[PDB]
C-alpha cells in the first residue's frame, strides 16, 4: 500500500466490484491509455463508445513534450500535473490504467512508470486490460465522465529515467544492464522500424533484446514471477544489477519495468528517447545492425 512494493497489478474482478460499490471518484480513477498506428485502430472513438465506468481518456499525444523533436518524450513537471490534475487526479488517488490492445496490454505499462516517474506511488495497470474486462462481460458504457478537477503535485524522479548522455557514458562504465524490448527483428536490423522517414532497425552495441510480448501469456494476462524470473535468467539479466530498458520511443521498455517490479526490483530505469533519439543523435559507431554499415 506503498512502495514497499505498491499493488501494481489489480484484477478485473477487483475493478468490477470497485466500480459496483460506487469506488470511483477522488480516491480511485480509471484511465484508459490506448493508441494505435495511425490508420489502423482508432483508439479515442473506440473510447468514446465502450469504456469501463467513469474511466477516462488518457491521451499521449498531449501528455508529452510537444517541442521535442523526438516521440513520446515525458512532459514536464508542471505540464504532467496539469494534465493528471484535470482528470480528476490528485496525490492521494488510487489509479488503475488499462488499453484496448488485442495483445492484452501495450502503453498501459507506459502510463504506470508516468506516474511513477513523477513520484505518484499508487497506480495500477489491470492484468488483462480491456480484453479480458470485455471477455468476462463486465460493465462498459459510453455515457461522458466529467470528473472535477483535483490538484496533483508532481516531482520528477530521475532514478527512473535515463537521458541520451547517461546512456553514452554506460557505454563505457558498462554499469548498467540495457535491455532492448523491441520485436527481435529490428532488434536485430532485419525488419525495419515503422512510420519514420530514413530511419534504419538495429540496436546499440552491448543491448540484450527481451521483446515484450514475451512478458504476457495468449490470454493477453502478465506472466507470474517465477515464469518472469526465469525469463530474465534465460537471458542472462541479472536483477540484482542495475539495469535499463529502452525500445522504439520508450513505451513497450515499460513492460520490462513492471515485469522487474513484480519481481521485486522497483528500480529499473527507463530510456525515454530510445531508438528514436538514439539513431538521430549518437554515432553510428555505437550502434549495430544485421546490414549497411
Excluded at 242 to 268: N, Q
Amino acid at each position: 500500500v506503498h512502495q514497499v512494493l505498491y499493488r501494481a497489478l489489480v484484477s478485473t474482478k477487483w475493478l468490477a466490484e470497485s466500480v459496483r460499490a460506487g469506488k470511483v471518484g477522488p480516491g480511485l480513477r480509471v484511465l484508459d491509455a490506448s493508441w494505435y498506428s495511425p490508420g489502423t485502430r482508432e483508439a479515442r472513438k473506440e473510447y468514446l463508445e465502450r469504456h469501463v465506468p467513469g474511466a477516462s481518456f488518457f491521451d499521449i499525444e498531449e501528455c508529452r513534450d510537444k517541442a521535442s523533436p523526438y516521440e513520446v518524450m515525458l512532459p514536464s513537471e508542471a505540464g504532467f500535473a496539469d494534465y493528471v490534475g484535470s482528470l480528476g487526479i490528485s496525490n492521494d488517488t488510487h489509479v488503475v490504467v488499462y488499453d484496448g490492445d488485442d495483445l492484452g496490454s501495450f502503453y498501459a505499462p507506459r502510463v504506470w512508470w508516468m506516474f511513477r516517474v513523477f513520484g505518484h506511488r499508487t497506480v495500477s495497470v489491470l492484468n488483462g486490460g480491456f480484453r479480458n474486462w470485455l471477455k468476462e462481460g463486465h460493465p462498459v458504457t459510453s455515457e461522458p465522465s466529467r470528473p472535477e478537477p483535483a490538484i496533483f503535485k508532481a516531482t520528477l524522479n530521475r532514478s527512473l529515467l535515463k537521458t541520451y548522455e547517461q546512456v553514452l557514458e554506460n557505454l563505457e562504465s558498462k554499469r548498467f544492464q540495457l535491455v532492448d524490448s523491441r520485436a527481435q527483428g529490428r532488434y536485430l536490423g532485419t525488419q525495419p522500424e515503422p512510420d519514420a522517414v530514413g530511419l534504419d532497425s538495429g540496436h546499440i552495441r552491448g543491448s540484450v533484446n527481451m521483446p515484450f510480448m514475451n512478458f504476457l501469456t495468449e490470454d493477453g494476462f502478465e506472466k507470474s514471477p517465477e515464469e518472469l524470473r526465469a525469463m530474465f535468467e534465460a537471458k542472462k539479466v541479472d536483477l540484482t544489477k542495475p539495469l535499463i530498458a529502452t525500445c522504439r520511443k520508450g513505451v513497450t521498455a515499460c513492460h520490462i519495468a513492471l515485469a522487474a517490479y513484480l519481481c521485486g526490483k522497483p528500480d529499473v530505469a527507463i530510456y525515454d528517447g530510445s531508438w528514436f533519439e538514439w539513431f538521430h543523435r549518437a554515432p553510428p559507431e555505437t550502434w549495430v545492425s544485421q546490414g549497411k554499415g
